[PDB]
Ligand binder design. Structure first.
Ligand code: 7H8
Ligand code: NA
Ligand code: ZN
Length: 104
C-alpha cells in the first residue's frame, strides 16, 4: 500500500541480519519454511504468515506450500535491490517470464 523501496538502502536496517529476521517468526506453523523466508530477506510481522522484506519493505501473505519465497519476492517486488543483489537479473527475468506465461 506504501510505495516499494527501490533504493540500494534498506528500509528496515534493524532487520538487515539473517539472525534478526529469524527471531521474528517464533514457533512457525506455516507451510513455508522460516529459514527459507529469512534467506529471501523476509521477517515475520506476528499476524498470520504476513512477512515483509527488510530492504524493499514489501509484504506478502497466505503462503501456499507450492509458493517459493524468492519467486514471490521477484513476482510482487521486482524493483527490490536486495533481491537483485542475491539472485541476479537473469534469475529475475526467468521468474517474470515464467509467471507472465503461467497466465497463458
Ligand atoms: C506468498 C503469496 C503472496 N501472494 C501475494 C500477496 O500476499 N500480496 C500481493 C500484494 C503485493 C498485492 C499484497 N498486498 C498486501 C498484502 C497483505 C500484507 C502482507 C504483509 C504486510 C502487509 C500487508 C499481500 C499482498 C498471495 C496472494 N494474495 C493475498 C492477498 C492479495 C494477493 O494477491 C499468495 N501467497
Ligand atoms: Na510465532
Ligand atoms: Zn525486497
Amino acid at each position: 500500500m506504501n510505495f516499494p523501496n527501490s533504493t540500494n538502502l534498506p528500509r528496515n536496517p534493524s532487520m538487515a541480519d539473517y539472525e534478526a529476521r529469524i527471531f521474528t517468526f517464533g514457533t512457525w506453523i506455516y507451510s513455508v519454511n522460516k529459514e527459507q523466508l529469512a534467506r529471501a530477506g523476509f521477517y515475520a510481522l506476528g499476524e498470520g504468515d504476513k512477512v515483509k522484506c527488510f530492504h524493499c519493505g514489501g509484504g506478502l501473505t497466505d503462503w501456499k506450500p507450492s509458493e517459493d519465497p524468492w519467486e514471490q519476492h521477484a513476482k510482487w517486488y521486482p524493483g527490490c535491490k536486495y533481491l537483485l543483489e542475491q539472485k541476479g537479473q537473469e534469475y529475475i527475468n526467468n521468474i517474470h517470464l515464467t509467471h507472465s506465461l503461467e497466465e497463458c
